[PDB]
Design an enzyme around this catalytic site. Structure first.
Site, short mmCIF file in Angstrom:
data_model
loop_
_atom_site.label_atom_id
_atom_site.label_comp_id
_atom_site.label_asym_id
_atom_site.label_seq_id
_atom_site.Cartn_x
_atom_site.Cartn_y
_atom_site.Cartn_z
N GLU A 35 0.82 -1.21 0.00
CA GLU A 35 0.00 0.00 0.00
C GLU A 35 0.85 1.26 0.00
O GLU A 35 0.57 2.21 -0.73
CB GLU A 35 -0.93 0.02 1.21
CG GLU A 35 -2.04 -1.02 1.17
CD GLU A 35 -3.08 -0.79 0.08
OE1 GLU A 35 -3.01 0.21 -0.68
OE2 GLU A 35 -3.98 -1.66 -0.02
N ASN A 46 -7.90 8.66 -5.88
CA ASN A 46 -8.67 7.65 -6.61
C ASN A 46 -9.51 8.28 -7.70
O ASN A 46 -9.79 9.47 -7.66
CB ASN A 46 -9.59 6.90 -5.66
CG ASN A 46 -8.85 6.25 -4.53
OD1 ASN A 46 -9.18 6.46 -3.37
ND2 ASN A 46 -7.83 5.47 -4.86
N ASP A 48 -12.61 8.10 -8.24
CA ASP A 48 -13.88 8.63 -7.74
C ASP A 48 -13.72 9.96 -7.00
O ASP A 48 -14.70 10.57 -6.60
CB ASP A 48 -14.62 7.59 -6.87
CG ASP A 48 -14.00 7.41 -5.49
OD1 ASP A 48 -12.85 7.85 -5.27
OD2 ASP A 48 -14.66 6.82 -4.61
N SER A 50 -12.03 10.37 -4.15
CA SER A 50 -11.56 10.10 -2.80
C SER A 50 -10.03 9.98 -2.80
O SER A 50 -9.41 9.94 -3.86
CB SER A 50 -12.18 8.81 -2.23
OG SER A 50 -11.73 7.67 -2.93
N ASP A 52 -6.58 8.03 -0.64
CA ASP A 52 -6.07 7.04 0.32
C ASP A 52 -4.90 7.64 1.09
O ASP A 52 -4.03 8.30 0.50
CB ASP A 52 -5.59 5.79 -0.40
CG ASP A 52 -6.62 5.25 -1.35
OD1 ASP A 52 -7.80 5.14 -0.97
OD2 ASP A 52 -6.23 4.95 -2.50
N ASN A 59 -9.08 4.98 2.99
CA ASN A 59 -9.78 5.77 1.99
C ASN A 59 -10.83 6.74 2.55
O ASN A 59 -11.65 6.36 3.39
CB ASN A 59 -10.43 4.80 1.00
CG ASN A 59 -11.12 5.50 -0.12
OD1 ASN A 59 -12.32 5.70 -0.06
ND2 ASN A 59 -10.38 5.88 -1.13
#
Ligand SMILES: [Cl-]
Ligand SMILES: [Cl-]
Ligand SMILES: [Cl-]
Length: 129
Positions: A35, A46, A48, A50, A52, A59
């Site tokens: 990650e 991301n 969308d 959002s 992380d 998220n």
């Protein structure tokens, strides 16, 4: 902060993540490796909209507030910035909620794709724990 492998394993254990919800420490270290490469300051945007955050790339759609993810929730009740601290407490406490949400560590797509089913104990091999 960029953690060493064993250093992170020790910190995760200190915070009660080892075998949490049945997931051995190597699972958590492996997830963090892929990650964030063990970097607490890791962020990624991301598709969308959002973002992380942190060592476990938690998220903002569900788990933290960043003020710029429309229609999102903040189920860990924290600013997303808390997930970037050198102190992993906020990331660990939030991860405990995430992994308890129903799908276990499959919540981390990178865990599913790169850690699940592998020899995850290799990630804590040699570590004084
Ligand atoms: Cl393990
Ligand atoms: Cl928001
Ligand atoms: Cl992946």
């Amino acid at each position: 902060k960029v953690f060493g492998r064993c250093e992170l394993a020790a910190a995760m254990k200190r915070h009660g993540l080892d075998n949490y919800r049945g997931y051995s420490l190597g699972n958590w270290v492996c997830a963090a490796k892929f990650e964030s490469n063990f970097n607490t300051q890791a962020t990624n945007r991301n598709t969308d909209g959002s973002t992380d955050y942190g060592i476990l790339q938690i998220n903002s759609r569900w788990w933290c507030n960043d003020g710029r993810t429309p229609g999102s929730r903040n189920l860990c009740n924290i600013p997303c910035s808390a997930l970037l601290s050198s102190d992993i407490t906020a990331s660990v406490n939030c991860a405990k909620k995430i992994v308890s949400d129903g799908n276990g560590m499959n919540a981390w797509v990178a865990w599913r794709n790169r850690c699940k089913g592998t020899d995850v104990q290799a990630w804590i091999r040699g570590c004084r724990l």
